[PDB]
């Protein structure tokens, strides 16, 4: 029950309840998705309808996001209305109704559309494929529900039981008086939650290297590489990603995107080459794997990749900093590879 | 007349043991004279369904009750058209004549009443 | 499809008089409406033939 | 919450709040509304060399990040620093807009940039149907008038553009009297204004831009039928309010009453909007959103929408316009009050994001037009003071029996003729 | 132009023109499928309609099948009508019209339905996955068209040009007088075809071992193994397949199917474990891989697997025989593996 | 949908007289049919009022 | 009258240089007096389309010709309703007035005629 905050002379506050219940810890496939889609439905005292109608008149909205690790229940509002949104978020965590008809009429539709939006963007099909082959059953669990194994209303309830506990969440208010926030959290249903355990395991996730998958796809072709990083060797890969996505690198206009996904215990580096035809995708990645295999750096972005890693303001609550003014060199060891699209015209792992 | 209103009046009678002992026997005898149980129907099968509350309610009925209502209704029409009643061993017994659709109806009426309330809320400064 | 369905005039006849789905259990009390149409026809036909002779 | 603007030889505007990074930039008082039909796209091209691999690597060595935005009334070139490097951003600004403003326009750089804004503007027209439609809305609403020119320029004026056109534009609009230097982030006013009054040298001071002819709304339509697209996308608007209109806020509130919608988001289906009772029964659209767009000379008030229900487009338009009729005759207290609260929330989320580049653009555009920025708390005072009587008097002037402007693309066979749409801008009375 | 035959005192003859143009040799994906679907459309002298109406009155039908290697144009008819069906098959090979509207109205629909039937049977999704990872670009080419890369009418025509040649086909008539058949083939448009080259390469196809793929699927779960075989070591795997699909093996009721696909230059052994839930699929294959790793045989089926390999009558035109009365022992080396279905509940390659 | 569409009687009126899709280019020669309906009405109305006085 | 029949008669005239030199000038002058080219139409745009042959034919038309026919037809209606003709530089020229739909029509008529022939074939033993 870590209750953070930070005041300011502004007018918009934003409460936020982070909860360790993303796809990482998921008993059945997509159940974290369904639960995230179930937030802000009916509680036992307040209907989804009344919540919206009330918050609108006050001047604030709700929103529930899904990560590979976090389910975050956020609330954005006018400053002096704090207690209401604290108790609203409290209500949801403690006592959402989970009516069978809410499942069929609101949650399953909303999830089906989520899966559909993602089913048609081939970098996301790739990113999911990258996770599933590196970490074979941890962070490589499916992000979204697609119905490959049954998930009943009970499974969604059981999972809410595990994940919504005092030990497994952190309240976090931006633009809030810490005094009143802590005061309001302890005086609510938050402090009356069961506090089971947290599944933030310190042990490095076991990832398998030199893995590749090929998915046939009608649309744009995309070839992607993904590299497992260390708990400490991650801040160099961060400058790598920001180097590859900058005018310093000559091969920045040869890729679509490159990023490092930072977690609580390691991370994953991703690189995305995407274009219409398979010829331009083959070349632009065959070059990258050859150019980074004989890699370089010389800390050129060391202040720029510190600029970019700082302008992520929300981050603060931010991990390791001065690891940039440390290592500046980069090789390119073994990685993981996925070809999505015109597959009979894309590189295999052999020839990179 | 809404089922919320029938439930209000009915529950008031059912609790107060003055009325409860006076009326329920009258009501029990009314239900037997009605005769719908001899056709194999439960009362809730008889509710007029051509309105949004009842369509919401029937939509929310679990599969197995839905298939059962369908059979009871079809069986009632066939018996009606032959100008017979069912064999007595096929009649609905009082233990079976449960308000199975009532909770779905009451739930839908409350949801509807709240929307009507919220669409028309006044504000005071 | 069958001509009784596809033709512009016959499809009216088909949907009102031929394929029109009736509840299986309606009794002879539901025969009165056709008897009213019949009555309307009897009144009109006999009235026109009488009008020919009426001042 | 600050607004410190003071004029030395140039006009300097800042707004500081201890955040993390600092953003410095120059914002010129001339945009796509200042171009011609024939050099349309020159500003967008300027933006794109300013962010070219050559200029962008010189900034990334120094640990600086580049940002630019072309609008209708204005134009902005912005560098974000890490906040002690607030001086090395001003170095990059001047090393570009005095020194390198003759080195950025090298033959090989220009041709590789022109080739990239051509693939860019083409991609827009081929695929971005909502913004494509909204851009054509301005085109027909304000035809033969400065606001009709699209911000990205047209493919035909673009491919016929040369280095001398960039030059001639830069020499007429990148002037001192048509400029404001803006700093947002955490850096003080006196921290920046001294680094500016450090170096003198005016550069083309005393030179004014070129005057023009005023923008005007013309009720009209452009219909970009395409039966191969899987949806219809339409935008429809009346003449709205310019910035620094008395009814600037009444208009914005009126748009919040009908708000925006997304059929697939459970929460969105539950909003306190009367229009939603009508459109959800047969699912008349996938989404809509109302807007009050304001510019220097004029604005557009209306809505945009997207739909796969291609045989009931006329019900979409009819129910939406019947709702708008209500603003003149029957809008309720609690609708107005709901809009106040939600207008504050959204205006807040705009003016105070955690991103100084947005703050710079909002500050820059404001001070260029009225010579000052109205504070967020000052806006809320104006918003709270709006009565039902105000909205009615506004709608009766801007909405009731007024001409409209329409644009659409995709499967719009079911979007009825102009006069049918235009007749619904009112109701029959005794 | 190998013209085989074999007479009999029966009434039904069956002409057949085998042609080396299956998915094995395919310039673009599915083009062999489209061409197979284009056979018996319009020629330049005879419409598809007239061909059917004429052959019906005579008393014979046509049919065009697709293999991983062969496109076979077969014709079944009454005996004494031989010349007609020889010239009909001749007409198709030499001069099918390939009208653009036949593509859009008949061929693409028929192919789309083909792909749809196969898209819903999870053993076939597996079998395709097995081929694609063993032989990465030869016999691992997609069998059916699915539109991942463009195929125009021209591509179908170009491919018909390569594949329909005198050197790349074999006429083969069952229940036919070889005298009249050879006489009718040489007197037709068959002998007036260009004779380019044949792509029946003798070199063993390069297959990669220890490969695995996982496809998520709503329906039954199926785990499959696939083993590359030698040109000479294939007749032992044949008895293996017939051993596993017989009452001699104790683990016959633990698998759905097992077979050896014999080609011109090697083969592929396949084993299919398929059931509703993922628990029964995991066990039944985890046992098989463990039971065959400590394998056996002792030639128990050596007359039975010779019975089964003989009752394939059509085969005759049959390869190696007495390789059964030779080797009787079997290990289980490295293979290839695919999990299709409830994937988060199926074995990885590690644990087999 | 709009009431003119949803109502059983009004939808007839809507599909024949209001939303009925006409080719943009029909000229005044296509006005004769409405003039014939008008004629039919004039004949019927004036005939009934005269019938009241006719022997 | 079928296009197969119009083609029969027309081609006979077009080949025999007696008739060919006699008629084509008459036909050329008839086409100019017709006036459809002043509206921006090609003759094949004028063919009545409400029958199965013409629907088959239009279905088989390549995309680019289809979009072009659509524009010419819409432009013709708009000009007709304004009681104008197009600017002369917009008229269809004789070089452009090609029978672009004719081959698709003739193909469909032959296919149809064969089906009718085959559905009605007699047999002799
Ligand atoms: C719904 C239809 C009609 C009804 C209910 C109806 C009813 C009647 C009644 C009650 C009478 C007096 C009967 C009597 O003689 O005691 C009458 C007379 C008459 N009706 Fe009708 N009538 C109908 C239609 C018509 C029509 C369409 C005509 C056509 C001209 C018509 C022509 C006459 C004539 C000529 C008489 C006088 C002869 C007589 O007394 O029967 N009626 N009608
Ligand atoms: C399509 C409808 C009709 C047509 C074309 C029509 C035509 C005519 C004509 C040509 C005449 C003689 C006019 C003359 O006086 O020279 C006439 C007379 C008459 N009509 Fe009709 N008529 C029609 C409908 C009706 C109807 C429904 C009635 C209703 C009773 C009616 C009642 C009469 C009467 C009372 C006369 C004698 C008065 C007179 O001469 O004008 N008519 N009609
Ligand atoms: C869903 O429910 C239904 C249902 O829809 C129907 C149709 C029926 C069957 C009943 C019917 C179809 C009744 C239909 C009849 C009518 C609507 C009649 C309308 C009335 C008229 C008066 C007809 C018009 C007649 C005339 C103008 C008379 C013609 C005059 C002549 C020939 C004069 C001749 C003389 C001379 C000298 C020339 C049902 O039974 C039923 O439920 C069981
Ligand atoms: C696709 O093409 C169309 C199209 O469809 C339409 C509808 C129109 C517009 C034209 C029309 C809608 C014409 C419609 C009119 C009719 C069908 C009329 C039918 C005829 C009648 C005679 C009506 C019935 C009338 C009566 C019984 C008379 C009422 C008598 C009274 C009130 C007696 C009163 C007296 C006393 C004493 C009580 C077009 O113009 C058109 O192309 C451009």
Curated annotation (Swiss-Prot), chain D:
Keyword terms, alphabetized: Electron transport, Membrane, Mitochondrion, Mitochondrion inner membrane, Respiratory chain, Transit peptide, Transport
Cellular component annotations (GO), alphabetically ordered: mitochondrial inner membrane; mitochondrion; respiratory chain complex III
Localization per record: Mitochondrion inner membrane
Domain of life: Eukaryota
Entry keyword annotation includes Magnesium: no
Keyword match Transmembrane helix: no
Pfam family, one: Peptidase_M16
Membrane topology: Peripheral membrane protein
GO biological process: aerobic respiration; cellular respiration; mitochondrial electron transport, ubiquinol to cytochrome c; protein processing involved in protein targeting to mitochondrion; proton transmembrane transport
Disulfide cross-links: none
Predominant localisation class: mitochondrion
SUPFAM superfamilies (UniProt xref): LuxS/MPP-like metallohydrolase
Chain segments annotated as coiled-coil in the UniProt record: none
Miscellaneous note of the record: Present with 19300 molecules/cell in log phase SD medium.
Biological function: Component of the ubiquinol-cytochrome c oxidoreductase, a multisubunit transmembrane complex that is part of the mitochondrial electron transport chain which drives oxidative phosphorylation.
Protein name: Cytochrome b-c1 complex subunit 1, mitochondrial
Protein source organism: Saccharomyces cerevisiae (strain ATCC 204508 / S288c) (Baker's yeast)
Gene designation per UniProt: COR1
């Amino acid at each position: 029950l870590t209750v953070s905050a930070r005041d300011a002379p502004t007018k918009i506050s934003t409460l936020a309840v982070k909860v360790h219940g993303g796809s990482r810890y998921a008993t059945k496939d997509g159940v974290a998705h369904l639960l995230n889609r179930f937030n802000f439905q009916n509680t036992n005292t307040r209907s989804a309808l009344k919540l919206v109608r009330e918050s609108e008149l006050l001047g604030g909205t709700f929103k529930s996001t899904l990560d590979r690790e976090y389910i975050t229940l956020k609330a954005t509002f006018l400053k002096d209305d704090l207690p209401y949104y604290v108790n609203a978020l409290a209500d949801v965590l403690y006592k959402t109704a989970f009516k069978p008809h809410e499942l069929t009429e609101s949650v399953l539709p909303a999830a089906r559309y989520d899966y559909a939006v993602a089913e048609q963007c081939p970098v996301k099909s790739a990113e999911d494929q990258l996770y599933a082959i590196t970490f074979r059953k941890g962070l490589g669990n499916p992000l979204l529900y697609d119905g490959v194994e049954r998930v009943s209303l009970q499974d969604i309830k059981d999972f809410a039981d595990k994940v919504y506990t005092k030990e497994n969440l952190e309240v976090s208010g931006e633009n809030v008086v810490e005094a009143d926030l802590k005061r309001f959290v302890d005086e609510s249903l938050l402090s009356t939650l069961p506090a089971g355990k947290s599944l933030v395991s310190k042990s490095e996730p076991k990832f398998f290297l030199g893995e590749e998958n090929r998915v046939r796809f009608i649309g744009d072709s995309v070839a992607a590489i993904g590299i497992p990083v260390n708990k400490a060797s991650l801040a160099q890969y961060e400058v790598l990603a920001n180097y590859l996505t900058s005018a310093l690198s000559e091969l920045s206009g040869l890729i679509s995107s490159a990023k490092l996904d930072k977690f609580t215990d390691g991370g994953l580096f991703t690189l995305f080459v995407r274009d219409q035809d398979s010829a331009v995708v083959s070349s632009n990645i065959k070059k990258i794997v050859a150019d980074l295999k004989k890699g370089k750096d010389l800390s050129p972005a060391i202040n720029y990749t510190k600029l970019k890693n700082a302008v992520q303001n929300e981050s603060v609550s931010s991990p390791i900093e001065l690891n940039f003014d440390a290592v500046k060199d980069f090789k390119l060891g073994k990685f993981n590879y996925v070809a999505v699209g015109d597959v009979s015209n894309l590189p295999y792992l052999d020839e990179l | 007349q809404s089922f919320t209103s029938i439930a209000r009046i009915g529950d008031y009678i059912l609790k107060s043991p003055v009325l409860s002992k006076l009326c329920v026997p009258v009501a029990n005898q009314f239900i037997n004279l009605a005769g719908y149980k001899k056709l194999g129907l439960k009362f809730d099968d008889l509710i007029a369904e051509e309105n949004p509350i009842m369509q919401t309610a029937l939509r929310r009925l679990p599969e197995d009750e839905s298939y059962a209502r369908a059979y009871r209704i079809i069986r009632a029409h066939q018996t009606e058209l032959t100008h017979h009643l069912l064999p007595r061993n096929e009649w609905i017994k009082a233990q079976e004549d449960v308000p199975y659709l009532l909770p779905y109806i009451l739930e839908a009426e409350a949801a509807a009443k709240e929307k009507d309330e919220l669409d028309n809320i006044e504000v005071s400064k | 499809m069958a001509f009784r369905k596809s033709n512009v005039y016959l499809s009216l006849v088909n949907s009102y008089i031929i394929d029109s789905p009736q509840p299986s259990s309606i009794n002879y009390w539901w025969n009165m409406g056709s008897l009213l149409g019949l009555c309307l026809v009897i009144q009109i036909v006999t009235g026109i033939f009488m009008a020919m002779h009426y001042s | 919450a600050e607004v410190t603007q003071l004029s030395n030889g140039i006009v300097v505007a800042t707004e500081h709040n201890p955040a993390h990074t600092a953003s410095v930039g120059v914002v010129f008082g001339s945009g796509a509304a200042n171009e011609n039909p024939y050099n349309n796209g020159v500003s967008n091209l300027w933006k794109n060399i300013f962010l070219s691999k050559e200029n962008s690597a010189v900034a990334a060595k120094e640990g600086l990040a580049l940002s630019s935005n072309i609008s209708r009334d204005f134009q902005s070139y912005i560098v974000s620093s890490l906040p002690g490097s607030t001086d090395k951003s001003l170095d990059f600004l001047n090393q570009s807009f005095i020194q390198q403003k003759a080195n950025l326009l090298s033959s090989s750089n220009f041709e590789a940039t022109k080739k990239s804004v051509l693939k860019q503007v083409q991609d827009f027209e081929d695929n971005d149907h909502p913004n494509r439609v909204l851009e054509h809305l301005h085109s027909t609403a304000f035809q033969n008038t400065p606001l009709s020119l699209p911000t990205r320029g047209t493919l035909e004026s673009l491919e016929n553009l040369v280095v001398a056109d960039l030059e001639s534009f830069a020499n007429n609009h990148f002037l001192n009297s048509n400029a404001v230097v803006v700093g947002t982030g955490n850096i003080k006013h006196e921290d920046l204004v001294n680094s500016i009054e450090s170096k003198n040298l005016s550069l083309q001071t005393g030179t004014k831009p070129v005057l023009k002819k005023k923008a005007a709304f013309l009720g009209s339509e452009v219909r970009l039928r395409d039966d191969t697209l899987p949806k219809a996308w339409i935008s429809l608007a009346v003449e709205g309010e310019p910035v620094n209109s008395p009814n600037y806020f009444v208009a914005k509130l009126a748009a919040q009453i009908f708000g925006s919608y997304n059929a697939f988001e459970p929460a969105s289906r539950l909003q306190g909007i009367k229009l939603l009772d009508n459109i959800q029964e047969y699912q008349l659209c996938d989404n809509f959103n109302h807007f009050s767009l304001s510019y220097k000379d004029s604005g557009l008030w209306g809505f945009s929408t997207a739909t796969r229900n291609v045989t009931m487009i006329d019900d979409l338009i009819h129910f939406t316009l019947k709702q708008w009729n209500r603003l003149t005759i029957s809008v309720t207290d609690t609708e107005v009050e709901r809009a106040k609260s939600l207008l504050k929330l959204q205006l807040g989320q705009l003016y105070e994001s955690g991103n100084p580049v947005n703050d710079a653009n909002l500050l820059g555009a404001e001070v260029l037009i009225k010579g000052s920025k109205l504070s967020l708390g000052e806006a809320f005072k104006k918003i709270d003071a709006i009565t039902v009587k105000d909205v009615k008097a506004w709608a009766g002037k801007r909405l009731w029996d007024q001409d409209i402007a329409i644009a659409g693309t995709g499967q719009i066979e079911g979007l009825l003729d102009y006069m049918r749409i235009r007749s619904d801008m009112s109701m029959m009375r005794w």
